Amino acid sequence: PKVNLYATFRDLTGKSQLELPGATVGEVLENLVRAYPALKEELFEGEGLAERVSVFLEGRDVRYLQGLSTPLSPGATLDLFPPVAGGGFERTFGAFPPWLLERYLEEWGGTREGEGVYRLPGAVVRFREVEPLKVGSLSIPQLRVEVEGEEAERWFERIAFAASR
Amino acid sequence: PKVNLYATFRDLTGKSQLELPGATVGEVLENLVRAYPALKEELFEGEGLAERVSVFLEGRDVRYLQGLSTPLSPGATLDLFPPGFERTFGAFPPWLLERYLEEWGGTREGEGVYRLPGAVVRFREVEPLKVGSLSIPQLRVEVEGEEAERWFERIAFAAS
Ligand SMILES: [Cl-]
Numbered sequence: 281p282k283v284n285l286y287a288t289f290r291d292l293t294g295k296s297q298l299e300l301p302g303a304t305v306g307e308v309l310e311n312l313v314r315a316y317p318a319l320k321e322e323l324f325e326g327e328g329l330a331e332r333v334s335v336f337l338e339g340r341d342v343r344y345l346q347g348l349s350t351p352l353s354p355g356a357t358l359d360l361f362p363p364v365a366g367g368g369f370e371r372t373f374g375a376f377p378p379w380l381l382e383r384y385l386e387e388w389g390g391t392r393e394g395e396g397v398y399r400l401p402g403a404v405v406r407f408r409e410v411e412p413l414k415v416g417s418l419s420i421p422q423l424r425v426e427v428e429g430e431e432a433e434r435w436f437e438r439i440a441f442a443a444s445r
Numbered sequence: 446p447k448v449n450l451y452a453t454f455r456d457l458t459g460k461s462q463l464e465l466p467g468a469t470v471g472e473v474l475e476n477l478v479r480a481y482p483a484l485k486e487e488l489f490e491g492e493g494l495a496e497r498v499s500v501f502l503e504g505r506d507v508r509y510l511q512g513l514s515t516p517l518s519p520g521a522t523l524d525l526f527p528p529g530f531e532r533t534f535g536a537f538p539p540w541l542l543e544r545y546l547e548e549w550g551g552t553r554e555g556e557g558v559y560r561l562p563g564a565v566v567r568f569r570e571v572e573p574l575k576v577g578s579l580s581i582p583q584l585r586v587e588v589e590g591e592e593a594e595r596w597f598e599r600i601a602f603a604a605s
């Protein structure tokens with residue numbers, strides 16, 4: 281599975297993304313600390329996950345799934361965040377059209393403040409289509425999404441959840 | 446989702462794996478056809494799934510699931526076979542694979558060589574990968590026989 285590191289975790293390892301083996305969230309995280317032990321102190325509190333850390337599987341907080349026991353497929357992606365704080369995060373989504381993201385933002389009560397700019401409670405979401413990816417004769421649009429604000433983490437993951445649909 | 450191409454599909458596209466969008470098996474196959482149109486008739490029969498092709502989701506034949514309606518997560522991996530196969534598994538211990546092979550009625554013919562009803566499984570450790578301070582074992586698994594596809598996929602299921 282792929283592991284995306286944010287904020288503190290990124291600064292502490294020099295890495296933004298890693299590919300690590302594991303059939304459950306726990307297995308992947310145990311391998312993460314075997315690879316970068318500097319993260320052990322912040323990721324685990326005793327045997328379980330540290331209470332202030334947030335781990336998301338395809339946009340879903342794993343705590344509301346099966347936590348460390350959550351099964352995952354080999355190609356799954358996890359997002360790891362240290363204690364919540366105001367910030368800015370970005371991600372490029374494949375085949376996630378602007379109009380569709382807009383519909384989600386509108387359905388969440390977001391207010392349009394410009395073309396590709398929406399304000400949500402505690403965050404501002406900015407998005408623009410970048411260079412499409414080419415797979416054979418198929419052009420796959422790519423959408424760059426940036427989220428910043430006190431609740432940037434929350435909305436950033438809500439968007440990842442939406443895109444997974 | 447990721448799509449692994451085997452035999453015919455691999456040689457034609459010249460690709461072993463592709464990253465394609467889609468929330469269901471059907472959608473991914475649709476985009477696959479878009480990427481390589483020459484596969485339309487070899488995968489679809491109008492709006493339905495072809496009958497000679499085989500599609501597996503994390504080692505499970507989708508025909509026994511929900512067919513084209515089978516839901517898919519972004520991290521899903523599909524293996525597609527047209528009418529020998531191999532994969533290198535990361536951190537898939539030999540003793541574990543062996544326990545599965547035996548549970549499936551397999552017979553140990555030698556070191557890293559087991560025989561199954563319809564196939565022969567060959568496996569060996571290759572150069573490990575390295576991520577940070579962690580060494581990740583790499584097990585290369587090769588499957589041949591009349592039922593190689595089926596067994597290769599059950600091993601993929603077991604590894605996951
Ligand atoms: Cl947990």
Ligand SMILES: [Cl-]
Nearest residue numbers: 547548549550
């Ligand atoms: Cl069996």
